[PDB]
Amino acid sequence: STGSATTTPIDSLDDAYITPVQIGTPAQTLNLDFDTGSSDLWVFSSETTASEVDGQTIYTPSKSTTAKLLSGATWSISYGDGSSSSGDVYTDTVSVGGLTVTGQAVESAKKVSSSFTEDSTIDGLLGLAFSTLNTVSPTQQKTFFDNAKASLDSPVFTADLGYHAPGTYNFGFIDTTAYTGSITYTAVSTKQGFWEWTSTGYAVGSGTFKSTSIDGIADTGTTLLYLPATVVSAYWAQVSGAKSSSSVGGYVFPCSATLPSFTFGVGSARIVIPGDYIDFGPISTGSSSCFGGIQSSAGIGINIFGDVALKAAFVVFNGATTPTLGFASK
């Protein structure tokens, strides 16, 4: 089997991407944030505290003839941005882009933190990291990909995120028309439950490539590119007037600037992030200070190849017995 679904930016900045997902019988379609940095499929629901729902579409298990309470199971998750959610668990039929999993754990939110309530466009998350990170207790549950894997034509999914445009998540096949050149594959460590890999270096604009190992995670659920402070300083030093602002929470730059590109290495290959991808717009409405898309990972404890980086590539998440990642230009 295969599946193919379009993923759409939630706003004009590409702050996140939503993908329609069918849950239950008859189908209830919710727009979920596919997150290769976590491993829970959770949804706003008829059980979510009413004051914490503000415009999201909810899953109502009582209206699904295939929903079953997973008795005794609870979940609770906290994300790197400080947001969180928790609740109980149903199993139900879940389909993505024509690919169907029966008996998928659907984690129904009883509580969500303010940032989820305040984002009316995201109805929940669909985790695509390794199932060892799933938070369901006392019986850990499998991700949608883990459940689908054995049925797929090939044990892979691909992320093809757009810049200020829709893109595609494919399951079970590699669309050879969706990228240019060849795909360069690189080793993955699953020891932390992430799609963790080592970039071979970077360049800023037209500058020379610096060969240096940068361990980090391929994380579709993180907006920005978080790299070591040395790398990030070298980037922003090429932008007149850019500075790190403790009050804003990262590097800012004059909105009048033209940003240089940023290149990262994948083996001997190179992925180029155009400068425009690094502009996250005014820090507050009408400001001439703009927020940078490359930020320091110091204090986060891990480097994160988020959407800013991934959207410059066609990315293969290879879930073979020994997982690997593939990157191609596009």
Curated annotation (Swiss-Prot):
Disulfide topology: 255-290
Keyword Disulfide bond: yes
Enzymatic reactions: Hydrolysis of proteins with specificity similar to that of pepsin A, prefers hydrophobic residues at P1 and P1', but does not cleave 14-Ala-|-Leu-15 in the B chain of insulin or Z-Glu-Tyr. Clots milk
GO terms assigned for molecular function: aspartic-type endopeptidase activity
Highest taxon of source: Eukaryota
Coiled-coil spans in chain: none
EC main group: hydrolase
Chain ranges of the Peptidase A1 domain: 17-328
E.C. number: 3.4.23.22
One BP annotation, GO: proteolysis
Keywords: Aspartyl protease, Disulfide bond, Hydrolase, Protease, Signal, Zymogen
Active site: 35, 199
Keyword Repressor set for record: no
Entry's family note: Belongs to the peptidase A1 family.
Name by which UniProt lists this protein: Endothiapepsin
Native organism: Cryphonectria parasitica
